[PDB]
Amino acid sequence: IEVNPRVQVEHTITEMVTGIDIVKTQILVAAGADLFGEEINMPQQKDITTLGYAIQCRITTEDPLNDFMPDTGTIIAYRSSGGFGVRLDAGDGFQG
Amino acid sequence: ELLEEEQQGPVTEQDIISYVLYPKVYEQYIQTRNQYGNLSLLDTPTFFFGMRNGETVEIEIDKGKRLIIKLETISEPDENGNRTIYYAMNGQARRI
Question: For B88, which residue in chain A has the nearest alpha carbon?
Answer without folding.
Answer: A96
